Design a protein around this ligand. Structure first.
Ligand SMILES: O=C(O)CCC(=O)c1ccccc1C(=O)O
Ligand SMILES: O=C(O)CCC(=O)c1ccccc1C(=O)O
Ligand SMILES: [Mg+2]
Ligand SMILES: [Mg+2]
Lengths: 311, 311
């Protein structure tokens, strides 16, 4: 195109219901920004995704207070052996395991978490993400059952804040709010309803680093940063947010570049010893060209999100 | 701008509900003044904060009667482990501990005060600040429970003067008034109702050093000076007030610069051996630029506060 270009990168394994990650990269005065909302989101919800991309490309991010950020391994809803192998090849001591994947059984989840705990040893930290797939009763039951593997916290066990609050009062395992933070009328409900012990922050859906920092301040709860499975361009913003937070009690979910078959930078944001450096990424003209698709449709989508944001 | 310049400095840890300290610095004939009222305060309440800034930048302060001022360690609502470390490394023999933080348990407060007492040893002085969070009955029993750690005084146990007066009649621990002094229609009601043994003075909220000295005399009660978590510019005014008071029976809460991630001076006002020197501070163009932000919003806010003060 010229400045804003679309890409389509296949994932190494189905994650969040997709097998291909699409988005657009935009070059601005501050550097590169990534606009990659998942397909189903309308312009109104994409507005904030645009705001994040705009901030990254045109405004820049708040200075970091740390030069590196710790990350957790991301384990998709796969089999126990491969789940254990992702952990073994991660270099991370904390792992977040997907559970309650549509079409799978609760037995699969137990086997997966078990495999992950064994792969980490007794010292590892194990989290699970339900993406709100369980009702209150099932959540209390499963959390209790899976806690024999010692859980650090359970991310979004149920769909709504009221449900998280109920679960929180019936289990000892800490609860983290994600969807109730990034896809909710009022994110502060988590705080007021004391529905979670930890608040998850994702840069794009929250409208950028400054927006995410403000929300973290308003909630007054321990926070953790995670990605939306972006290329190194999008991940750099996530790293920027994690590096700007006053305190990072939890390893961040920014080791997701491994989930993609390729990246758009010559020096990808790949963790080393479970840690990522705080740095801007330089897009590789040649690397992008290899995964760049026709920009028309994506440019139209970006324009719609922009309008929604400005109007 | 060329005159008033806005800053945004991240805190090392959440305190008083914020994670970033914003404000404006103004250079006048006398030196630098700081205007940093917290976000929620309207122009009428901000009027005194402006008056303090104006006094510091344009008028100068009353000559000091002492060359250094003693300070107490400020302990945020953190875990017992870190609370102890803050005190042990403070160089202070007096520590003020935050209790009744929204969302925390009374058990946490007991654990925190205990850890602080243990850190200071037997000869230390321990105060607690409730920020008016407790009702009368709760304050009475909590003060009794926490007094097994030997409290110097309890700062603002309840929200209103009438409540402080009732608590004072039922407990043996001295009571200090803070918000009942700085955020009240009639500060002297504290004296008239004999609701406190100690009066807390904060420069910006009270409208400056001269205004604070005037109130100190009228209240006819022992006083202590503390900060509003300012940069060295604002803290210099607090030190100036402490240095001009007849006597300082209590160490002052001016050891708060450590709560900020950075300062605007090359020679920051950090205590050494529990004292701060009484001296003007020189702002560093470089240090300020690093945390400076667009002053548009803040300049508009300062003009409103100033307008409210002059009328
Ligand atoms: O947190 C991680 O380990 C990676 C981020 C992640 O899991 C994720 C990725 C895309 C969409 C949603 C989520 C989620 O946290 O639920
Ligand atoms: O007194 C100290 O130790 C530091 C000053 C302090 O506690 C404070 C700082 C900001 C806002 C309110 C207060 C307070 O004393 O209630
Ligand atoms: Mg999640
Ligand atoms: Mg106080």
């Amino acid at each position: 195109s010229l400045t804003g270009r679309a890409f389509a990168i296949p994932l190494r394994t189905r994650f969040r219901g997709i097998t291909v990650r699409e988005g657009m990269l935009v070059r601005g005065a501050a550097g590169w920004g990534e606009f990659s909302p998942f397909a189903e989101y309308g312009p109104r919800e994409c507005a904030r995704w645009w705001a994040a991309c705009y901030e990254a490309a045109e405004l820049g991010w708040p200075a970091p207070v740390r030069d590196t950020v710790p990350v957790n391994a991301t384990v998709p809803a796969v089999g126990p052996e491969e789940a254990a192998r992702i952990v073994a090849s991660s270099g991370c001591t904390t792992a977040k395991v997907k559970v309650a994947e549509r079409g799978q059984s609760e037995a699969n989840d137990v086997a997966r978490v078990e495999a992950v705990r064994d792969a980490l040893g007794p010292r590892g930290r194990v989290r699970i993400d339900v993406n709100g797939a369980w009702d209150v009763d099932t959540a209390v039951r499963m959390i209790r059952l899976l806690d024999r593997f010692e859980l650090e916290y359970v991310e979004q066990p149920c769909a709504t804040v009221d449900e998280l609050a109920e679960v929180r009062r019936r289990v000892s395992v800490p609860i983290a709010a994600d969807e109730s933070i990034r896809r909710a009328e009022d994110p502060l409900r988590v705080r007021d309803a004391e529905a979670a012990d930890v608040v998850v922050l994702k840069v794009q859906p929250l409208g950028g680093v400054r927006a995410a920092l403000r929300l973290a301040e308003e909630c007054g709860l321990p926070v953790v940063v995670s990605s939306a499975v972006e290329t190194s361009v999008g991940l750099a913003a996530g790293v920027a947010l994690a590096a700007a937070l006053p305190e990072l009690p939890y390893a961040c979910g920014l080791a997701t570049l491994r989930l993609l078959h390729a990246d758009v930078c010559d020096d990808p944001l790949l963790p080393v010893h479970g840690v990522l450096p705080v740095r801007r990424v330089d897009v590789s003209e040649q690397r992008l060209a290899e995964v760049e698709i026709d920009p028309a449709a994506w440019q139209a989508r970006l324009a719609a999100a922009r309008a929604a944001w400005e109007q």
